[PDB]
């Protein structure tokens, strides 16, 4: 899934 520091 998406890493902590994504977006």
């Amino acid at each position: 899934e998406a890493d902590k520091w994504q977006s």
Partner: antibody, heavy 132, light 108 residues
């Protein structure tokens, strides 16, 4: 200066439980967005990511080892513990813990996330052999 | 899961050469990629973070470029301490994968 060091048993028998401790200095696991992860390296093989834990206490694990791993932190002792259950011979490897930076902040405002993209400081590694 | 393939897996070179190692991801990882150099008997050492930023204290002959699915590390003038194994690591998706490594040894 950030330094980390792994400790635990050098030898462990199959089916047993392995508890590894990462003791560090130079940062606190209460600092903003910081992480501490574990990576292993069987002799002669590639690095393999195992798990990581952040100061806000979010935890993530390798899907292949999820059922056998538990990672936890002890903020006041500056330690991160990784517990692996039911080990078998293929778990023999050198185990490293490592620091992961949190985003850079300016007057306590996150302004740069590029520094989180790497594990920047590593411990020397601890060699663990699994044999009965 | 996500696959990180390094090329070449092994590479021969001499002091003074320019080498470039490449790492390709099966799905885009944006710029969340790091390069490390690991000398025998030692832990990996961070060279480049966030695909192209030079880590503090790391010599300028090391350079990283690329984003998305293709990245490259180039060492412009190989020094003796660079005979080692290099790894790339993706940090966009969990688990945070490592490539298979590329061994750089003395050509003869």
């Amino acid at each position: 200066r950030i330094t980390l060091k792994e400790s635990g048993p050098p030898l462990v028998k199959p089916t047993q439980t392995l508890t590894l401790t990462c003791s560090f200095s130079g940062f606190s696991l209460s600092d903003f967005g910081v992480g501490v992860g574990w990576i292993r390296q069987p002799p002669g093989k590639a690095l393999e990511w195992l798990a990581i834990i952040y100061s806000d206490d979010d935890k993530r694990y390798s899907p292949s080892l999820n059922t056998r791993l538990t990672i936890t932190k002890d903020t006041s002792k500056n330690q991160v513990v990784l517990v692996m259950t039911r080990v078998s011979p293929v778990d023999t490897a050198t185990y490293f813990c490592a620091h992961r930076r949190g985003p850079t902040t300016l007057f306590g405002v996150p302004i740069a996330r590029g520094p989180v993209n790497a594990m920047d400081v590593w411990g020397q590694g601890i060699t663990v052999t699994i044999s009965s | 899961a996500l696959q990180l393939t390094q090329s070449p897996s092994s590479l021969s070179a001499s002091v003074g050469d320019r080498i470039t190692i490449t790492c390709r991801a099966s799905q885009g990882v944006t710029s969340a990629l790091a390069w490390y150099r690991q000398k025998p008997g030692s832990p990996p050492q961070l060279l480049i973070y966030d695909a192209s930023s030079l880590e503090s204290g790391v010599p300028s002959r090391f350079s990283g470029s690329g984003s998305g699915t293709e990245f490259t590390l180039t060492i412009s003038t190989l020094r003796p301490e660079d005979f080692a194994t290099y790894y790339c690591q993706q940090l966009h998706f969990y688990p945070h994968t490592f490539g298979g490594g590329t061994r750089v040894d003395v050509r003869r």
